[PDB]
């Protein structure tokens, strides 16, 4: 809710090229901080955020080991799945997993998360109560049967409610200046004429954090929601994000159009307009 930590696992089989590749990335809100690529020079976890750098070599070593094990556990899983679906040992297949804990104002866990997928489609998901499972197709039921007999559900609940939250709180503190300080968007309206009667008003928002932002065009107070062209929030490349909303206006009516910016890094929602230079 207030914050959250997530990991993204990706295990793919490389028939004819090599062993199943396993990659894992770690996130705390909209910030990545770690990476493990079993197909690297020396399989070891690497930092992707300044605040995780302060961790001892011990941390990296343990992570590397956990991943070196998980990398192997997945090798089997990949094979087992080809089995279930009767797939041949000549095509690629991908097992993707995403788990994490949502921190709530109560300090403790607000919601546990564990979603697993196969070849892009849903396979199995741990239910909200951190005890049940939801199988997509029959094959998932086979795995469900195992994971229940293996009491994985119990172990995961323990992890999310505890160690997950504990480590998350730590990360938020360690990178407090970033993970806990919102970066408001730098905006401006660009205007380029398409003809001698129409021009494009493009409302810009750059360098903000988190990615959650909303910006829309209006005229006289009435929304242009249907006429607004939006781009998906793309990463600027330095941990902050970019996004823009464009709309075509009749040369003359410009000033009736206003852009409205909403982002938690803004004490009050911005209301922009184009200004001739």
């Amino acid at each position: 809710g207030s914050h959250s930590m997530r990991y993204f696992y990706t295990a793919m089989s490389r028939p004819g090229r090599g062993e199943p590749r396993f990659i894992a990335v770690g996130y705390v809100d909209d910030t990545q901080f770690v990476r493990f690529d079993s197909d690297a020079a020396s399989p070891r976890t690497e930092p992707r955020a300044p605040w995780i750098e302060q961790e001892g070599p011990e941390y990296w070593d343990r992570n590397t080991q956990i991943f070196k094990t998980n990398t192997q556990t997945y090798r089997e899983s990949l094979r087992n799945l080809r089995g279930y679906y009767n797939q041949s040992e000549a095509g690629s297949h991908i097992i993707q997993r995403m788990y994490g804990c949502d921190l709530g104002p109560d300090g403790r866990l607000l919601r546990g998360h564990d979603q697993s997928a196969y070849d892009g489609k849903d396979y199995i998901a741990l239910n909200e109560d951190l005890s049940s499972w939801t199988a997509a197709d029959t094959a998932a039921q086979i795995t469900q049967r195992k994971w229940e007999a293996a009491r994985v559900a119990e172990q995961l609940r323990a992890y999310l409610e505890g160690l997950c939250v504990e480590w998350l709180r730590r990360y938020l503190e360690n990178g407090k200046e970033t993970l806990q300080r919102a970066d408001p968007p730098k905006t401006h309206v660009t205007h380029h004429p398409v003809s001698d009667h129409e021009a494009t008003l493009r409302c810009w928002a750059l360098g903000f954090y988190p990615a959650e932002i909303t910006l829309t065009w209006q005229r006289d107070g009435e929304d242009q929601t249907q006429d607004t062209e939006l781009v998906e929030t793309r990463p600027a490349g330095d941990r902050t994000f970019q996004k823009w909303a464009a709309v075509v206006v009749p040369s003359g009516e410009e000033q009736r159009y206003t852009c409205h910016v909403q982002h938690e890094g803004l004490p009050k929602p911005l209301t922009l307009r184009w200004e001739p230079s």
């Binding site: 894992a24 998980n70 396979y123």
Partner: peptide, 9 residues
């Protein structure tokens, strides 16, 4: 810190 996955699918 990621948990140790010891059970396959």
């Amino acid at each position: 810190l990621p948990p140790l996955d010891i059970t396959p699918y």
